[PDB]
Amino acid sequence: PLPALKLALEYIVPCMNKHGICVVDDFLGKETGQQIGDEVRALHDTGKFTDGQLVSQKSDSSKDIRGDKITWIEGKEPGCETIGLLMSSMDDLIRHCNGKLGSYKINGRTKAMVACYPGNGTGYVRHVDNPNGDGRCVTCIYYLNKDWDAKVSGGILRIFPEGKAQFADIEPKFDRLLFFWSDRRNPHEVQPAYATRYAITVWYFDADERARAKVKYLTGE
Amino acid sequence: LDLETLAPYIPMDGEDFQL
Ligand SMILES: O=C(O)CCC(=O)C(=O)O
Ligand SMILES: [Cl-]
Ligand SMILES: [Cl-]
Ligand SMILES: [Cl-]
Ligand SMILES: [Mg+2]
Ligand SMILES: [Mg+2]
Numbered sequence: 085p086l087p088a089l090k091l092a093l094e095y096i097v098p099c100m101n102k103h104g105i106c107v108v109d110d111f112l113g114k115e116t117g118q119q120i121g122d123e124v125r126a127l128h129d130t131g132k133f134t135d136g137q138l139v140s141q142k143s144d145s146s147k148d149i150r151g152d153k154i155t156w157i158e159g160k161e162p163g164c165e166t167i168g169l170l171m172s173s174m175d176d177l178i179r180h181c182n183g184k185l186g187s188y189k190i191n192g193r194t195k196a197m198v199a200c201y202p203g204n205g206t207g208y209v210r211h212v213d214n215p216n217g218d219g220r221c222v223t224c225i226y227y228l229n230k231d232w233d234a235k236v237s238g239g240i241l242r243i244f245p246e247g248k249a250q251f252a253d254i255e256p257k258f259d260r261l262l263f264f265w266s267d268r269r270n271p272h273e274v275q276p277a278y279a280t281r282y283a284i285t286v287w288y289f290d291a292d293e294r295a296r297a298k299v300k301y302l303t304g305e
Numbered sequence: 306l307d308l309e310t311l312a313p314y315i316p317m318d319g320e321d322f323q324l
């Protein structure tokens with residue numbers, strides 16, 4: 085197992101700066117990944133998930149755009165402590181990278197979005213996570229689908245990194261951690277899922293961009 | 306097209322965690 089310092093500086097940082105996408109497989113190991121899976125399944129079973137929403141809701145149903153159901157987790161809720169461990173581990177990696185990811189100064193993040201595509205061909209249309217400057221600079225996703233066969237069950241995250249001659253197809257594999265720049269460099273989509281698909285996302289904020297975004301929100305722009 | 310109509314919602318105030 086690589087320490088956070090080496091994984092951040094010798095792998096995540098150069099991969100993010102060269103490609104804008106970075107995959108770390110077998111991030112937490114099978115035992116912890118299974119416990120996270122159980123916590124997510126209990127959120128699902130107890131009706132905590134609600135339809136995923138969009139930054140700007142207009143005339144169309146949210147379900148025309150994203151077919152997932154989600155809840156937000158801080159990591160200290162009863163029954164969510166292993167999700168909290170995951171979040172702490174993501175945070176430790178970012179802290180060890182901080183200052184070397186582009187020109188960003190990362191001060192904070194969202195709560196964790198625990199999301200489920202409930203099979204049935206649901207997915208997420210082509211989108212950019214942060215197209216207009218809301219502060220988000222890095223998207224971090226942890227996948228927890230044991231026994232996923234994407235050739236049958238679909239659910240690939242396809243990213244279209246700007247300037248590259250190939251797309252990036254990310255299978256939502258158990259215990260996989262993914263980072264990518266949240267801005268318009270990385271439009272992406274979740275292809276239809278034909279089995280229940282779970283993932284946990286946090287977004288990290290750039291300090292200056294997030295402060296500007298909060299100013300715009302608080303002044304009504 | 307307003308790309309914010311496709312972007313995943315986050316809370317804009319009250320809910321940011323500080324690292
Ligand atoms: O689950 C994933 O692979 C990505 C989900 C996604 O693009 C989003 O929720 O903004
Ligand atoms: Cl890059
Ligand atoms: Cl930083
Ligand atoms: Cl696109
Ligand atoms: Mg919630
Ligand atoms: Mg809860």
Ligand SMILES: [Mg+2]
Nearest residue numbers: 235236237238
């Ligand atoms: Mg398929």
Ligand SMILES: [Mn+2]
Nearest residue numbers: 212213272313
């Ligand atoms: Mn996305």
